[PDB]
Write an enzyme that holds these catalytic residues in place. Structure first.
Site, PDB file in Angstrom:
ATOM      1  CB  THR B 256      -0.982   0.194   1.745  1.00 11.31           C
ATOM      2  OG1 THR B 256      -0.095  -0.171   2.238  1.00 11.31           O
ATOM      3  CG2 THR B 256      -1.273  -1.567   1.416  1.00 11.31           C
ATOM      4  CG  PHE B 382      -6.529   5.662   6.235  1.00 16.24           C
ATOM      5  CD1 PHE B 382      -5.085   5.382   6.225  1.00 16.24           C
ATOM      6  CD2 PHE B 382      -6.715   7.500   5.628  1.00 16.24           C
ATOM      7  CE1 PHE B 382      -4.093   5.699   5.017  1.00 16.24           C
ATOM      8  CE2 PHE B 382      -5.168   7.619   5.360  1.00 16.24           C
ATOM      9  CZ  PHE B 382      -4.616   6.885   4.808  1.00 16.24           C
ATOM     10  CB  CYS B 389      -6.194   2.315   8.090  1.00 15.11           C
ATOM     11  SG  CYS B 389      -4.761   2.207   7.650  1.00 15.11           S
TER      12      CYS B 389
HETATM   13  C1  HEM Z   1      -2.086   4.594   1.957  1.00 13.75           C
HETATM   14  C2  HEM Z   1      -1.656   3.365   3.069  1.00 13.75           C
HETATM   15  C3  HEM Z   1      -3.451   3.123   3.718  1.00 13.75           C
HETATM   16  C4  HEM Z   1      -4.810   3.331   3.458  1.00 13.75           C
HETATM   17  C5  HEM Z   1      -5.254   4.156   2.280  1.00 13.75           C
HETATM   18  C6  HEM Z   1      -5.167   2.460   4.358  1.00 13.75           C
HETATM   19  C7  HEM Z   1      -6.592   1.531   4.040  1.00 13.75           C
HETATM   20  C8  HEM Z   1      -6.739   0.718   5.162  1.00 13.75           C
HETATM   21  C9  HEM Z   1      -9.098   0.779   5.239  1.00 13.75           C
HETATM   22  C10 HEM Z   1      -9.712   1.467   4.718  1.00 13.75           C
HETATM   23  C11 HEM Z   1      -8.738  -0.370   6.057  1.00 13.75           C
HETATM   24  C12 HEM Z   1     -10.390  -0.430   6.954  1.00 13.75           C
HETATM   25  C13 HEM Z   1     -10.568   0.265   7.503  1.00 13.75           C
HETATM   26  C14 HEM Z   1     -11.793  -0.109   8.043  1.00 13.75           C
HETATM   27  O1  HEM Z   1     -12.581  -1.020   7.169  1.00 13.75           O
HETATM   28  O2  HEM Z   1     -13.303   0.995   8.122  1.00 13.75           O
HETATM   29  C15 HEM Z   1      -7.540  -0.598   6.472  1.00 13.75           C
HETATM   30  C16 HEM Z   1      -8.051  -1.439   7.263  1.00 13.75           C
HETATM   31  C17 HEM Z   1      -6.199  -2.614   7.921  1.00 13.75           C
HETATM   32  N1  HEM Z   1      -5.309  -1.420   7.842  1.00 13.75           N
HETATM   33 FE1  HEM Z   1      -4.780   0.128   6.059  1.00 13.75          FE
HETATM   34  N2  HEM Z   1      -4.283   1.207   5.205  1.00 13.75           N
HETATM   35  C18 HEM Z   1      -3.310   1.740   4.676  1.00 13.75           C
HETATM   36  C19 HEM Z   1      -1.936   1.546   4.917  1.00 13.75           C
HETATM   37  C20 HEM Z   1      -1.353   0.708   6.441  1.00 13.75           C
HETATM   38  C21 HEM Z   1       0.093   0.064   6.696  1.00 13.75           C
HETATM   39  C22 HEM Z   1       0.895   0.960   6.321  1.00 13.75           C
HETATM   40  C23 HEM Z   1      -0.473  -0.361   7.728  1.00 13.75           C
HETATM   41  C24 HEM Z   1       0.031  -0.880   8.886  1.00 13.75           C
HETATM   42  C25 HEM Z   1       0.353  -2.052   9.488  1.00 13.75           C
HETATM   43  C26 HEM Z   1      -2.316  -0.648   7.451  1.00 13.75           C
HETATM   44  C27 HEM Z   1      -2.969  -2.108   8.582  1.00 13.75           C
HETATM   45  C28 HEM Z   1      -4.385  -2.090   8.424  1.00 13.75           C
HETATM   46  C29 HEM Z   1      -4.453  -2.972   9.930  1.00 13.75           C
HETATM   47  C30 HEM Z   1      -4.355  -3.738  10.385  1.00 13.75           C
HETATM   48  C31 HEM Z   1      -5.922  -2.673   9.566  1.00 13.75           C
HETATM   49  C32 HEM Z   1      -7.351  -4.095   9.495  1.00 13.75           C
HETATM   50  C33 HEM Z   1      -8.325  -3.240  10.788  1.00 13.75           C
HETATM   51  C34 HEM Z   1      -9.079  -3.689  11.115  1.00 13.75           C
HETATM   52  O3  HEM Z   1     -10.252  -5.030  10.825  1.00 13.75           O
HETATM   53  O4  HEM Z   1      -8.986  -4.258  12.688  1.00 13.75           O
HETATM   54  N3  HEM Z   1      -2.598   0.062   6.419  1.00 13.75           N
HETATM   55  N4  HEM Z   1      -6.620   0.043   5.989  1.00 13.75           N
HETATM   56  C1  LIG Z   2     -10.663  -6.119  -0.634  1.00 15.34           C
HETATM   57  C2  LIG Z   2     -10.269  -7.661  -1.005  1.00 15.34           C
HETATM   58  C3  LIG Z   2     -11.248  -7.692  -2.298  1.00 15.34           C
HETATM   59  C4  LIG Z   2      -9.190  -6.817  -2.979  1.00 15.34           C
HETATM   60  O1  LIG Z   2      -9.736  -8.317  -0.437  1.00 15.34           O
HETATM   61  C5  LIG Z   2      -8.629  -8.079   0.510  1.00 15.34           C
HETATM   62  O2  LIG Z   2      -7.873  -7.493   0.373  1.00 15.34           O
HETATM   63  N1  LIG Z   2      -9.053  -9.153   1.982  1.00 15.34           N
HETATM   64  C6  LIG Z   2      -8.376  -8.495   2.973  1.00 15.34           C
HETATM   65  C7  LIG Z   2      -9.104  -8.617   4.715  1.00 15.34           C
HETATM   66  S1  LIG Z   2      -9.731  -6.887   4.575  1.00 15.34           S
HETATM   67  C8  LIG Z   2      -8.220  -6.078   4.549  1.00 15.34           C
HETATM   68  C9  LIG Z   2      -9.359  -3.944   3.779  1.00 15.34           C
HETATM   69  C10 LIG Z   2      -9.179  -3.681   3.249  1.00 15.34           C
HETATM   70  C11 LIG Z   2     -10.606  -3.870   2.978  1.00 15.34           C
HETATM   71  C12 LIG Z   2     -10.658  -3.296   1.164  1.00 15.34           C
HETATM   72  C13 LIG Z   2     -10.302  -2.993   0.288  1.00 15.34           C
HETATM   73  C14 LIG Z   2      -8.899  -2.590   0.856  1.00 15.34           C
HETATM   74  C15 LIG Z   2      -8.668  -3.708   2.098  1.00 15.34           C
HETATM   75  C16 LIG Z   2      -7.442  -5.591   5.370  1.00 15.34           C
HETATM   76  O3  LIG Z   2      -7.593  -5.770   6.220  1.00 15.34           O
HETATM   77  N2  LIG Z   2      -5.770  -6.401   4.798  1.00 15.34           N
HETATM   78  C17 LIG Z   2      -4.921  -6.459   6.005  1.00 15.34           C
HETATM   79  C18 LIG Z   2      -3.252  -5.591   5.517  1.00 15.34           C
HETATM   80  C19 LIG Z   2      -4.107  -4.861   4.617  1.00 15.34           C
HETATM   81  C20 LIG Z   2      -3.837  -4.890   2.946  1.00 15.34           C
HETATM   82  C21 LIG Z   2      -4.101  -3.691   2.128  1.00 15.34           C
HETATM   83  C22 LIG Z   2      -4.641  -1.985   3.869  1.00 15.34           C
HETATM   84  N3  LIG Z   2      -4.436  -1.844   4.333  1.00 15.34           N
HETATM   85  C23 LIG Z   2      -4.385  -3.462   4.983  1.00 15.34           C
HETATM   86  C24 LIG Z   2      -7.293 -10.513   3.159  1.00 15.34           C
HETATM   87  C25 LIG Z   2      -5.838  -9.921   3.500  1.00 15.34           C
HETATM   88  C26 LIG Z   2      -5.851  -9.069   2.104  1.00 15.34           C
HETATM   89  C27 LIG Z   2      -4.102  -8.925   1.985  1.00 15.34           C
HETATM   90  C28 LIG Z   2      -2.569  -9.467   2.681  1.00 15.34           C
HETATM   91  C29 LIG Z   2      -3.406 -10.599   3.853  1.00 15.34           C
HETATM   92  C30 LIG Z   2      -2.780 -10.930   5.092  1.00 15.34           C
HETATM   93  C31 LIG Z   2      -3.912 -11.417   6.299  1.00 15.34           C
HETATM   94  C32 LIG Z   2      -4.574 -11.754   6.036  1.00 15.34           C
HETATM   95  C33 LIG Z   2      -5.710 -11.493   5.275  1.00 15.34           C
HETATM   96  C34 LIG Z   2      -4.968 -10.589   4.050  1.00 15.34           C
END
Ligand code: HEM
Ligand SMILES: CC(C)(C)OC(=O)N[C@@H](CS[C@@H](Cc1ccccc1)C(=O)NCCc1cccnc1)Cc1cccc2ccccc12
Ligand code: HEM
Ligand SMILES: CC(C)(C)OC(=O)N[C@@H](CS[C@@H](Cc1ccccc1)C(=O)NCCc1cccnc1)Cc1cccc2ccccc12
Lengths: 443, 443
Positions: B256, B382, B389
């Site tokens: 990302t 996010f 996020c």
């Molecule tokens: C431009 C960078 C990024 C964008 C736009 C982004 C966006 C998002 C979005 C939209 C979600 C789902 C939020 C929701 O369902 O309300 C998410 C989940 C998550 N992101 Fe990112 N993310 C970014 C970078 C990162 C990075 C650098 C990490 C580093 C660890 C990260 C870790 C996670 C995790 C662990 C979740 C799981 C949320 C949960 O279910 O508790 N993301 N992100």
């Molecule tokens: C979306 C689609 C159909 C392509 O499907 C998935 O991406 N669904 C994933 C589970 S929801 C994902 C959050 C998310 C939702 C919508 C759009 C983008 C991200 C999430 O939390 N991702 C964990 C880390 C992350 C990735 C990108 C951005 N921020 C955080 C399934 C998934 C994807 C990639 C790596 C994974 C590793 C372990 C377990 C599940 C994983």
């Protein structure tokens, strides 16, 4: 369905429901086949889930299944899936599509074509010595499979295509085909899950190695070779079937050639006298380190005894199988349609009622003074009949050519870490637990 | 089961049996979501096989699902399998096990912890310039994702663990997660096949990347970091759950971060004036190429506008989803138990009833003169609420820090091969068809 062998009066271990007798596979295929061969006798039956298996050890019955009743009844091997586009590979192919492919490739390894490959194989024999001399001038235990595998890869790539590669460790992503516990335990015991995975493009061969080899063969249309033999017979062969055949050749040309050579070296080190007698003969047929030729390789008789006794002790087959495609009564024994007739090659290669001291490495079994007392339907490392190993003669050539070039230059002694005795891989395929490492010394 | 939305009086495209509405996905998720948002209005429903999906675009309704009724009803995302041992990854985890993990990792990215990472991220910012200066002194179009990916990998490895790696092209076998046609089309439309593949150790994440990352984390127990935060909270956390969390961080930290940075650069090249205004501000806050610090990054306001307008045009989310876990009536709309409430983020980010000229890149939307006219439940790159996020603040830091160090040193112009206009990947994930290549010029 678990009572067919009870019906036919054919002994065997009692099957648990669903699982059949797979739980006896904890010590591997081979230990189970030896046990039952002693426990029940010449003919017995078990179950791989709901697929009954008729094990036969009668040479007449073996000849009838492999050679006599091949085209009519015992034409196909046990089915293998999911495989995706590899369903057209000759070794999996069935019925008329196999016959079409088998004839299409039989002229690949004619004695005229095999002779043409000797000057080509002669090149990489020296690269093997040089790559050995490095790990020999530095007293460092050598993993034979790595350096033999590096050799067999270069040979099979040019003898069938035209591409070379010199140790840039076609890169030999031939690193798949990992046989063992799940998910293979599921398919063999629960079989209608195969058509599931097929419609999902799920494949027991990983997508990485395929798409890597799927494209690499496309670079192989540079504007008589195996590949040159396929387009000349295409001019109805598919563009995709051609690749499936290629993948069959590259794998078997790498894994089996390097595996048997490794097993061969372990035996020669554990018996220093045998290696002396074999080295004395190579210097007698090719003095001054004379280049090995097609006719000199077939001349060496002890070399042939060392290859066969090794293949006896380590049958990379372990079992041979054919699917009985309709009801028959071979040798006074009715066999229903659907049973998988199985020849327990590994157990047969160690039966004390055919070999004296079966576990001891003794090339002298296969001497012309004694090779008459050796049943060719007990000892079939390359199978037998119409569907035997299509690469047999070429593989025995490639191995013998390399054994000459190496033994002319080095000797092999065990290490501290060399597994003695060598434990076979208690898994599926016929490999060792610990890899084979041996000391190399320059002459 | 394909008549639930007809019952509730919620419009939507007619579903074909078994398939539902997946055939409308031929132009990708996003084109379908924009069409229906125009075709039906503020709220509509479709089917991903037999799983109905309620799309909602009402900010109040969005806030209620993401923020208000999160802990009680809309706690979990749509299930994701087969995954094997990755079921414990926080982003997949459900109900109480997720809450336990989410709190366990929230103190990872505190403003105190994020400030500590600025001197670490400052190192690899210079390696990015040097690796850019090579492909800049040789007028050779640069694939931004390769060099950005090489940068984000080095940053996430040290900020959470302690291991570095300098371009030896943890090696970033983060090359899986290939979303597209089968076999994902099968699972989403035919769902009870997931428990099949689970019992076979079949996993949508390949075995190669797992066992590679499964072991690599073991070397990460050298005798305050993310990993240092997990054993201190283990001293009940499993040894295997710890790895599952790691894999989540390494992926998101690489893919990302490098993806949005690549998208950001394409926008700055296609608008030379915007890149001038942004470069003039970086020289104003950090003259003499002054080292960017935690407080300078948060100070730059146009940098923040360039990041958000890019994220508006390319929401790496496209959709947000929560599984409705019991019957509710949010905002005068009954929603049965089991429906997947979905927020069509991509369509919302281009709705003409919220943005003027939605397709044109215009940082001036997010100016403090205009950022009041921007609904924070329409624009949620996010996500929002308790499950937004967890890396948001760190990712905005890492991207902005790198954007500063690069724009201080180079400028970016399009190439002949630069896809203009950039076609989005008509596939699944949010990527481009053709990769992003731009000319680099040294200042
Ligand atoms: C431009 C960078 C990024 C964008 C736009 C982004 C966006 C998002 C979005 C939209 C979600 C789902 C939020 C929701 O369902 O309300 C998410 C989940 C998550 N992101 Fe990112 N993310 C970014 C970078 C990162 C990075 C650098 C990490 C580093 C660890 C990260 C870790 C996670 C995790 C662990 C979740 C799981 C949320 C949960 O279910 O508790 N993301 N992100
Ligand atoms: C979306 C689609 C159909 C392509 O499907 C998935 O991406 N669904 C994933 C589970 S929801 C994902 C959050 C998310 C939702 C919508 C759009 C983008 C991200 C999430 O939390 N991702 C964990 C880390 C992350 C990735 C990108 C951005 N921020 C955080 C399934 C998934 C994807 C990639 C790596 C994974 C590793 C372990 C377990 C599940 C994983
Ligand atoms: C020491 C080396 C080898 C041994 C011991 C060996 C042994 C065998 C055996 C036992 C079979 C099954 C025969 C049967 O069912 O009766 C077989 C099949 C086969 N082997 Fe080998 N093999 C070796 C090397 C090779 C090589 C180098 C090739 C090169 C192409 C090759 C190609 C094949 C093919 C295509 C089949 C399929 C037979 C068919 O169904 O038509 N083998 N081999
Ligand atoms: C045996 C077990 C349980 C491990 O299973 C299989 O090995 N069964 C294969 C199909 S029968 C195999 C012949 C054979 C039978 C018994 C023992 C050894 C070999 C055969 O003909 N192999 C083709 C090339 C080859 C290999 C080794 C030696 N000589 C030739 C399935 C298979 C294996 C490996 C690569 C494949 C590539 C394409 C299609 C199928 C492939």
């Amino acid at each position: 369905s678990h009572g067919l062998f009870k019906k036919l009066g054919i002994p065997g271990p009692t099957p648990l429901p669903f699982l059949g007798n797979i739980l006896s596979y904890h010590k591997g295929f081979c230990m189970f086949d030896m046990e039952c061969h002693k426990k029940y006798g010449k003919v017995w039956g078990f179950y791989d889930g709901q697929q009954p298996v008729l094990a036969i050890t009668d040479p007449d019955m073996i000849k009838t299944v492999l050679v006599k009743e091949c085209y009519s009844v015992f034409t196909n091997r046990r089915p293998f899936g999911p495989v995706g586009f590899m369903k057209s590979a000759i070794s999996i192919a069935e019925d008329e599509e196999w016959k079409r492919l088998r004839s299409l490739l039989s002229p690949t390894f004619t004695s005229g074509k095999l002779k043409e490959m000797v000057p080509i194989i002669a090149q990489y024999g020296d690269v093997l010595v040089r790559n050995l001399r490095r790990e020999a001038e530095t007293g460092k235990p050598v993993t034979l499979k790595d350096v033999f595998g590096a050799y067999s890869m270069d040979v099979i790539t040019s003898t069938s295509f035209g591409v070379n590669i010199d140790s840039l460790n076609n890169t030999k992503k031939l690193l798949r085909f990992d046989f063992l516990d799940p998910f293979f335990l599921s398919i063999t015991v629960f079989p209608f899950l195969i058509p599931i995975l097929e419609v999902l493009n799920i494949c027991v061969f990983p997508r990485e190695v395929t798409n890597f080899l799927r494209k690499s063969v496309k670079r192989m249309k540079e504007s008589v070779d195996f590949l040159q033999l396929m387009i000349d017979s295409q001019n109805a062969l598919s563009d995709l079937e051609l690749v499936a055949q290629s993948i069959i050749f590259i794998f078997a040309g790498y894994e089996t050639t390097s595996s048997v050579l490794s097993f061969i070296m372990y035996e020669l080190a554990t018996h220093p006298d045998v290696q002396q007698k074999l080295q004395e003969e190579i210097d007698a047929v090719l003095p001054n380190k004379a280049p090995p030729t097609y006719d000199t390789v077939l001349q060496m008789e002890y070399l042939d005894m060392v290859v066969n006794e090794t293949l006896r002790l380590f049958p990379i087959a372990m079992r041979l199988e054919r699917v009985c495609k309709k009801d028959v009564e071979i040798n006074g024994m009715f066999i229903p349609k659907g049973v998988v007739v199985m020849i327990p090659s590994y157990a047969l290669h160690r039966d004390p009622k055919y070999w004296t001291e079966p576990e001891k490495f003794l090339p002298e079994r296969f001497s012309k003074k004694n090779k008459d007392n050796i049943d060719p339907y007990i000892y079939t490392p390359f199978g037998s009949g119409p569907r035997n190993c299509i690469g047999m003669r070429f593989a025995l050539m490639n191995m013998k050519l390399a054994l000459i070039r190496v033994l002319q230059n080095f000797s092999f002694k065990p290490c501290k870490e060399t597994q003695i005795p060598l434990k076979l891989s208690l898994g599926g395929l016929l490999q060792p637990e610990k890899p084979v490492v041996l000391k190399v010394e320059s002459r």
